[PDB]
Amino acid sequence: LMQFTLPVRLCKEIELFHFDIGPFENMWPGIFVYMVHRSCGTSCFELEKLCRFIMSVKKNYRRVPYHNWKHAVTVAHCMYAILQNNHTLFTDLERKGLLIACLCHDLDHRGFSNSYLQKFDHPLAALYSTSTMEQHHFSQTVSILQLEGHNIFSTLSSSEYEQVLEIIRKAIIATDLALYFGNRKQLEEMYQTGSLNLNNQSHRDRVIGLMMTACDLCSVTKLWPVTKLTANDIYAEFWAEGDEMKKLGIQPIPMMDRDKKDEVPQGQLGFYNAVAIPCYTTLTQILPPTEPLLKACRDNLSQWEKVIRGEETAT
């Protein structure tokens, strides 16, 4: 057989939650196949179809600062780390579908939120009234899966193919943060009342939804230098959307206003407290081996507080 192998440093460090996939775009397909062969198995997909699929997905991500090909692979790698440290908890189809969901979850993102598409009256807003971009990401996923030589699930039966596309559809839709607030609250109640049941499919769905949020936000779970640099990329998009809001004659929210740059550290603090910490807390409760995501999230929160107190500088 031909086994995928990484250089020594990547071989060791890819198992760490805070792994950064590096600046070499040409190595990311290899990194993704490696993670699929180790988390799913070398027999999960035909290498030729997986390779063709990967390259078509890459092609349908856009040259935007943040919601790009590097983000897709980064989210996939966080999912890899969760699956490998929880390997007894997931099904064959869940392993197969979830790395693919993560790779595909922002397909054809233009760097604009669901809100902007609503305010702009974009055609996608007429087609998909809620989770507008996330329904578009899924539709794009189906398009690519239906191209010639792209059916990576060809050896699944009809009913298995349908289950995995449904795992994928729900996972991608779950990356709509508007849906996360409700989903985490339900999971918090279920956990504290002891009703949470991983044998209940409607409960698996919520746990995977939370896993997808955690993978999607995983830039707040890298070492500080990565987190700080990645925050420049996310704000490049937010500020561009704010500009487009101003062009529509609508005052943008403060985080999207490039004139309010001095409030980024307080904005970050607000986001860690309201969204990120609660997310990784609940995930650690359900999947205790995901502790390192929560720990790195707390460390970065501490760093933003250091920035607010003028002990650290972010230029």
Ligand SMILES: COCCn1ncc(NC(=O)c2nc(C3CC3)ccc2Nc2cncnc2)c1C(=O)N(C)C
């Ligand atoms: C009401 O919203 C304003 C309150 N607010 N302030 C900031 C913020 N989000 C982020 O910073 C952010 N969002 C995402 C995705 C949800 C969009 C991912 C990463 C983020 N940070 C970050 C930090 N380091 C490195 N990479 C990325 C929000 C928010 O809640 N959103 C939903 C965007």
Ligand SMILES: [Mg+2]
């Ligand atoms: Mg998205």
Ligand SMILES: [Zn+2]
């Ligand atoms: Zn994303």
